[PDB]
Write a protein that binds this ligand. Structure first.
Ligand SMILES: [Mg+2]
Ligand SMILES: [Mg+2]
Ligand SMILES: [Mg+2]
Ligand SMILES: [Mg+2]
Length: 1408
RNA sequence: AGGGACAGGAUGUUUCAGUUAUUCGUGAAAACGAAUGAAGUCACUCUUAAAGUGAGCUGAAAUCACUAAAAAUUAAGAUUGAACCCGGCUACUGACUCUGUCAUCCGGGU
DNA sequence: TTGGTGACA
DNA sequence: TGTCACCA
């Protein structure tokens, strides 16, 4: 009947405490504890940044390919002959390295003319005393652009000497110049020369510079002369090439988006239509209107699109900035009472209700604006109906009735309503006023319709209660509906409807202050702009979030915002408001209630920022809300409900989706494990919590680059959060000034914190009366031994305590004083208990000791009790929606089969409340449930947090009634009861991405690592009978072959031949790369003859892999120190092992890669000869910081200046032999259609399992490649064909006999070279095998990393060769407890594990 | 500021090819320039003048596969998201033009 | 992190 | 066949 889920969201770790029970709170069993170890972005990718970067790399490559296709098509159409390879190469050279179109600016100057160089001398060394900075900067714009030594030195000194400003403070205080101008100059002046870095060295050039370069060097290219002659001029060909180079990927795509375009057909009309469509796509700047007109008149009016390209100027066709503002606009979240669902539920009856209620005089004036606001579509369903032109449900009359009905339902309790929300409530008591409401309702609406009307009204208010809680998705049968349509962006027509919400004006038709002026020219312009400048140019003081006033609503320090900013604002505020004071009066609300200097004013992001995106809701919703909140009319209805917007952080949405899926999956397994088969309504209530630690830990997982700064600011936020200590200024300070309030005295430094209204009496009240600050008290434990959970009156307090606190011991006098003092402070002031003065705060606290008939007693209790129902955050709302949807999806079959009904409810628990008020109590009771001070809470402590969330929700009244766990039992017995409920085991869930072996769209996974590896075959040198494999005849360059005849007999058909060119010279045989790769692919992809197998084997003997690595690799960037020759010239990077057997000529040895000579002459360069030492021990403490720049200067050189369109060189490299991992060759085609082979490395698993024969014998040696790699263009390096009639999967677990009964060992193949081992054993036995302590299992990490000594101890003490050792000591825990389950990947497989799993597999296989 | 998306830029890695220079100013050659579309330099092994090999340089091409005209394809998968194309202005949204066209929009499809 | 590959003995 | 290092 009752299913409960307590979840603590903490980012990486999400604790869970779940139970499904029939009678109240569960037994000791039926309760389960889980922690989700959510993998980081590397193990499970949530962010799309890498995917998007790969997509745009692909799109840039495709843009170039399609531009080259179109250029060849057009040049061959005009040429009327096929382009030769030389002409194609020249054209592609013209097309390569087209310039950029963004991130460039010329200059500006506003403040440099008004500063003195005599005071800038502290940062500028060479400018004279009386010089002006503007002229010097104008000279520098040319000096540094010419890379003049003096100008660059001056700017470098300007940047280097301005690191401190202590002297400049005295300078400005000695002459009293305006610091704002000099600060502006320094903040627009002290920028690094990006315009030089990414112009001269990095090769970034603007599109206009690219066009000028190609115009310069098209004549000089002799390959283009036939094409220039065909185009009848260099200028025309330049215009053609530049116009084609300006096309985006989408234009070329549109041209080539046709199956017949694979023939490269030149279509005149298609190209014209594409070019017209291409440049009509752009939103041009207002300045470029004439350029847009020129381009569109050229293309649209083109009688010959090729001649238009030849004549239209390329500089005009450079596309403007990508105005992607309309990409996926926001959807309005407003909830609307729907005539569609009202007609689905009921017939014409509901419109009859609306008409009957409209006939009543009390409905006078409710439909004033429905003649005008109904014209604007407000929902998605109405949009669909109007698009179809077949309005049925949303006919204007039905919509009028829906709006009127919603206004009647959303009527405020004071606005002449029928006391709805009271006739509906189950607590409706027989009263005269409820009659004076219901009789009016039945007089107006009628007598027959009233039952159905009130059922509808109850359903409506239940739905809006869910909606305002952020849980509108729980209803499962909505009667309102979301808008789901885009609102317009903030244009003037919309600001007309948004100005009134701030100025509190009843209505506004024209922007007369802007259209026609009132108080001269500056009625608004520059006058409110002074206020805007004050808002924006004070940096972090005024408009910045994380301010004290706005981040936590502490209202500044005390008042430090007023006397520093608003005193300056006051004059402008008066001047602006004098205009509206003539046209509007209000009850002083236009400037003292609605408009404020800060906080609720929000003028910064509504009125003072034009457009700036989309408005929140559609204009229909805005008009409805403005009418309901009638301002001058003192409101008429409650504002429209809205659904919770999805989280803006997409990676957060993915993380929450995965967490919700995992938790809903485990809850589905838990409910499906039950034997329920009746019509029972199973209510699933979820309890959730989180805090700033959630954001701090989700800065991780995402692995955000800002994680340093995010944690830097969240650490300050967390310090502020923890600063709320001593229960908000309590203990020995507030309630008592010392000693104890009940007898006691001589308290000392230690006491205890106790309540005034304990659990038993508090359970009769709602909300936070049980735990509020005004309820808690500090007392001696012996003093609190009496009246443990009973009412505490004034007389129970010690007389001396009242004499110290209030000055007299008379209870009557003190209660009269409390009644006097508490009445002076308003409700909203006493609720904010921290803002109170200590006398007032103690009066509020003591108000609880008064009897029930007291006014202060009842007022304080009915304030602190019904304080709030904590709304879920947007992130929490998203997680809740995802979990509820996925659980209700995964259990649909089970609920259908067993006729179960999953009712859902949800409540939030404050993280600070549970951690401070239940976690510490459970630390008292157990001492293993205490919160550590490790600066990061451990894994099982999140399951502890979830259990404490359940415990806290037990004491919340409404939750307890809806949870089935309501009881008035005292604290002691309750804490001794719920402590019995916490299980001794914690299951750890570590979500994983789908293995590429199991996912059908393998393209969603990165198949190959970026970076291509060079593939080489060792040359074969023959000089008579003397045959060597290698490069030279030196013993270090080649190895000898005992019998060359066998090697050549094998490789007859695969060797090229270089003849002697002399009589005593040798012959060089090189493997033909094309035939070698074809043969290796054939032996990988199909069964081949033994000749081909031998040929592939010998080819792989001759095969070696190299890859160029930058010459800067001789420098260690982290240590800022050069590496030694022992590290640079390590033999592992240069030696090739030759192991030709007796079958293949018996050549055995090692060959040094001849790139080692290049590396040697690199480390022996005269500039680097002394900076690089010879041995590791010789590399002492000396460090050189500018080594990388030195190497760049080594290899950078100036060219002959042949071509303006030449690529710059930035990386110089030499080959080395790298460490490889699952090499794969990819067969592709060059631009001429010739097959090219390039070697990559697999990014993921290579083998799908192991082959098992018809007798169940697992082949542990043969690698069974996955089927996605068995393509006609893919060749797995060293791969052989293998047929698997049946095979064992890598994820196939079987328990291993292992010859023991105290342990349970399971293993699976897991990985080709390493098995996975899962061990279930006692925690004490694990701590005996390993030198691992970690205290209790509640402090254990999910990822245990044994030290090398601990690894050796585990291996030795296990006495189990079939366990191996964990790889790098990493152990992943699956369950925590007295019995421990964990799994690990073995460091290396051994035959005992293989034999044991073979026996386990045979046990199942022979069973069949 | 977060996220997503568009537009890409530039350098890399690999494959292929060329290259290990030739003519003129002027011819002493001091003396290096120019041009040949660009590049044209070093190292080792060979033993006769040519070479083999490796590197550098220059140019282009390729730079996940199925897979190819375009698209999707480097996220996730229990589900989805995003992208792109086609049709439409009956209509939510954006741009503009003399306001009806075009879209990032809507509806479908992959 | 992890699936692979080399060298060593 | 295990062992130890290394790669992105
Ligand atoms: Mg892609
Ligand atoms: Mg390769
Ligand atoms: Mg390279
Ligand atoms: Mg279209």
């Amino acid at each position: 009947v009752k299913s409960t889920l307590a979840v603590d969201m903490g980012g990486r770790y999400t604790g869970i405490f779940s139970y499904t029970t029939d009678s109240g709170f569960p037994k000791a069993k039926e309760a389960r504890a889980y922690v989700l170890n959510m993998p980081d972005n590397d193990a499970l990718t949530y962010s799309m940044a890498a995917r998007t970067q790969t997509r745009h790399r692909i799109r840039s490559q495709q843009r170039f390919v399609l531009a080259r296709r179109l250029t060849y098509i057009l040049i061959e159409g005009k040429l009327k002959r096929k382009l030769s390879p030389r002409e194609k190469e020249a054209i592609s050279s013209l097309l390569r390295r087209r310039g950029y179109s963004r991130l460039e600016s010329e200059l500006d100057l506003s403040v440099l003319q008004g500063v003195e160089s005599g005071f800038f001398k502290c940062f500028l060394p060479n400018f004279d005393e009386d010089e002006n900075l503007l002229t010097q900067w104008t000279s520098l714009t040319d000096g540094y652009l010419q890379n003049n030594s003096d100008s660059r030195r001056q700017i470098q000194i300007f940047l280097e000497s301005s690191k401190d400003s202590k002297e400049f403070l005295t300078v400005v205080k000695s002459q009293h110049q305006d610091t704002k101008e000099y600060k502006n100059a320094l903040k627009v002046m002290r920028d690094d020369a990006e315009s030089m870095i990414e112009q001269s060295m990095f090769g970034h050039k603007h599109r206009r510079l690219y066009l000028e370069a190609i115009a310069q060097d098209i004549p000089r290219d002799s390959r283009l002369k036939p094409i220039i002659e065909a185009f009848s001029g260099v200028e025309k060909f330049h215009h053609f090439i530049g116009n084609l180079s300006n096309l985006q990927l989408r234009a070329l795509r549109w041209y080539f988006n046709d199956p017949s375009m694979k023939n490269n057909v030149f279509d005149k009309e298609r190209l014209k239509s594409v070019l017209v469509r291409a440049y009509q796509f752009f939103h041009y700047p207002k300045d470029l209107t004439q350029q847009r007109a020129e381009v569109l008149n050229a293309y649209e009016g083109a009688t010959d699109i090729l001649e238009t390209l030849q004549t239209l100027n390329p500089e005009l066709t450079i596309p403007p900035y990508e105005d992607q503002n309309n990409r996926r606009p926001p959807l309005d979240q407003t909830l609307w009472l729907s005539p569609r669902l009202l007609d689905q539920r009921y017939g014409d009856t509901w419109e009859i209700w609306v008409q009957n209620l409209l006939r009543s005089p009390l409905s006078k004036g409710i439909d004033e604006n429905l003649d005008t606001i109904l014209i604007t579509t407000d929902r998605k369903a109405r949009l669909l109906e109007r698009q179809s032109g077949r309005l049925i449900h949303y006919t204007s009359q039905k919509l009028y009735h829906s709006y009127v009905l919603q206004r009647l339902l959303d009527r405020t309790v004071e606005n002449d309503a029928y006391l709805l929300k009271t006739l509906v409530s189950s607590n409706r008591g027989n009263s005269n006023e409820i009659h004076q409401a219901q009789e009016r309702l039945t007089r107006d609406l009628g007598s027959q319709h009233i039952k159905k009307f009130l059922d509808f009204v109850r359903q409506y208010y239940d739905e809006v209660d869910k909606a305002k809680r952020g849980l509108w998705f729980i209803v499962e049968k909505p009667l309102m509906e979301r808008a789901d349509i885009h609102p317009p962006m903030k244009n003037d027509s919309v600001i007309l409807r948004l100005v009134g919400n701030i100025l509190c004006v009843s209505d506004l038709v024209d922007l007369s202050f802007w259209t026609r002026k009132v108080k001269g020219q500056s009625t608004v312009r520059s006058l409110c702009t002074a206020i805007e400048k004050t808002r924006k140019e004070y940096g972090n003081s005024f408009n910045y979030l994380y301010q004290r006033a706005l981040y936590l609503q502490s209202k500044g320090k005390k008042l430090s915002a007023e006397d520093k900013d608003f005193i300056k604002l006051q004059s402008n505020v008066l001047l602006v408001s004098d205009v509206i004071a003539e046209a509007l009066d209000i009850k002083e609300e236009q400037k003292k209630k609605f408009a404020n200097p800060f906080s609720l004013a929000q003028l910064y992001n509504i009125i003072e920022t034009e457009k700036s995106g989309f408005i929140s809701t559609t204009l229909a919703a805005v008009d409805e809300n403005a009418w309901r909140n009638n301002l001058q009319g003192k409101a008429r209805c409650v504002q429209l409900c809205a659904d919770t917007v999805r989280p803006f952080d997409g990676a957060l949405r993915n993380i929450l989706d995965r967490q919700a899926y995992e938790i809903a999956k485990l809850k589905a397994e838990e409910l499906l494990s039950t034997e329920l088969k009746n019509q029972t309504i199973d209510l699933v209530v979820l309890l959730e919590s989180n805090q700033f630690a959630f954001s701090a830990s989700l800065a991780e997982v995402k692995k955000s680059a800002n994680t340093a700064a995010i944690r830097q600011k969240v650490a300050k936020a967390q310090k502020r959060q923890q600063d709320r200590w001593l229960s908000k200024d309590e203990r020995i300070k507030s309630a008592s000034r010392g000693l104890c309030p009940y007898t006691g005295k001589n308290l000392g430094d230690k006491g205890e914190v106790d309540h005034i209204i304990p659990r038993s009496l508090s359970m009769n009240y709602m909300g936070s009366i049980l735990n509020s600050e005004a309820n808690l008290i500090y007392c001696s434990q012996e003093g609190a031994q009496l009246k443990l959970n009973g009412r505490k009156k004034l007389s129970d307090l010690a007389d001396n305590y009242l004499k110290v606190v209030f000055g007299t011991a008379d209870r009557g006098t003190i209660c009269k004083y409390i009644e006097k003092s508490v009445s002076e402070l308003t409700d909203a002031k006493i609720v904010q208990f921290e803002l109170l003065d200590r006398s007032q705060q103690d009066a509020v606290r003591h108000a609880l000791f008064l009897e029930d008939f007291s006014e202060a007693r009842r007022r304080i209790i009915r304030l602190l009790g019904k304080i709030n129902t904590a709304r879920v955050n947007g992130t929490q709302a998203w997680f809740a929606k995802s979990f509820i949807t996925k659980l209700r999806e995964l259990t649909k079959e089970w609920c259908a089969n067993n006729q179960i009904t999953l009712a859902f409810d949800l409540y939030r628990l404050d993280a600070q409340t549970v951690s401070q008020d239940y976690r510490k109590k459970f630390a008292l009771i157990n001492k293993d449930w205490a919160k550590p001070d490790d600066k990061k809470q451990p894994i099982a402590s999140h399951a502890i947090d979830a259990f404490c969330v359940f415990a806290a929700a037990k004491d919340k009244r409404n939750i307890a009634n809806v949870l089935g766990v309501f009881d008035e039992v005292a604290e002691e017995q309750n804490l001794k009861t719920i402590a019995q409920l916490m299980p001794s085991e914690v299951n750890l869930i570590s979500p994983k991405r789908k293995s590429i072996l199991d996912k059908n769209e393998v393209g969603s996974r990165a198949l190959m690592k970026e970076g291509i590896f060079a593939e080489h075959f060792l040359p074969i040198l023959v000089r008579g009978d003397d045959c060597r494999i290698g490069f030279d005849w030196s013993e270090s360059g080649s190895v000898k072959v005992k019998d060359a005849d066998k090697l050549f007999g094998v490789l007859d058909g695969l060797l090229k031949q270089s003849q002697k060119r002399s009589v005593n010279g040798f012959e060089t045989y090189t493997v033909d790369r094309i035939k070698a790769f074809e043969l290796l692919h054939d032996v990988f992809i199909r069964p081949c003859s033994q000749k081909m197998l031998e040929q592939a084997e010998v080819l792989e003997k001759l095969h070696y892999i190299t890859q160029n690595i930058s010459v800067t690799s001789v420098y260690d960037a982290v240590n800022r120190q050069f590496k030694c020759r022992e590290e640079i010239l390590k033999d592992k990077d240069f030696d090739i092992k030759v192991d030709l057997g007796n079958r293949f000529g018996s050549a055995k040895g090692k060959i040094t890669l001849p790139a080692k000579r290049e590396w040697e002459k690199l480390v022996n360069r005269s500039e680097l000869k002394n900076l690089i030492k010879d041995k590791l021990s010789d590399k002492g403490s000396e460090k050189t910081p500018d080594g990388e720049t030195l190497i760049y200067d080594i290899f950078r050189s100036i060219p002959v200046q042949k071509l303006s369109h030449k690529a710059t060189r930035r990386v110089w490299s030499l080959p080395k032999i790298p460490s490889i991992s699952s090499g794969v060759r990819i067969k592709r085609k060059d631009s001429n259609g010739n097959d090219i082979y390039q070697l990559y490395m697999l990014n993921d698993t290579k083998c799908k399992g192991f082959v098992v024969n018809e007798k169940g014998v697992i082949d542990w040696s043969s690698d069974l490649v996955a089927d996605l790699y068995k393509q006609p263009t893919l060749t797995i390096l060293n791969g052989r064909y293998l047929k698997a009639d049946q095979y064992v999967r890598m994820d196939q677990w079987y328990e291993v006999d292992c010859g023991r009964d105290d342990v349970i060992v399971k293993m699976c193949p897991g990985t080709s070279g390493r098995r996975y081992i899962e061990i279930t054993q006692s925690k004490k036995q694990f701590e005996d095998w390993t030198g691992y302590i970690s205290g209790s299992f509640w402090n254990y990490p999910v990822t245990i990393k044994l030290s090398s000594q601990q690894i050796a101890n585990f291996v030795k003490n296990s006495q189990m060769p079939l366990l191996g050792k964990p790889r790098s000591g990493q152990i992943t825990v699956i369950t925590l407890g007295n019995t421990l389950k964990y799994w690990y990947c073995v460091e290396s497989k051994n035959s005992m594990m293989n034999e044991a799993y073979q026996k386990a597999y045979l046990v199942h296989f022979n069973q069949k």
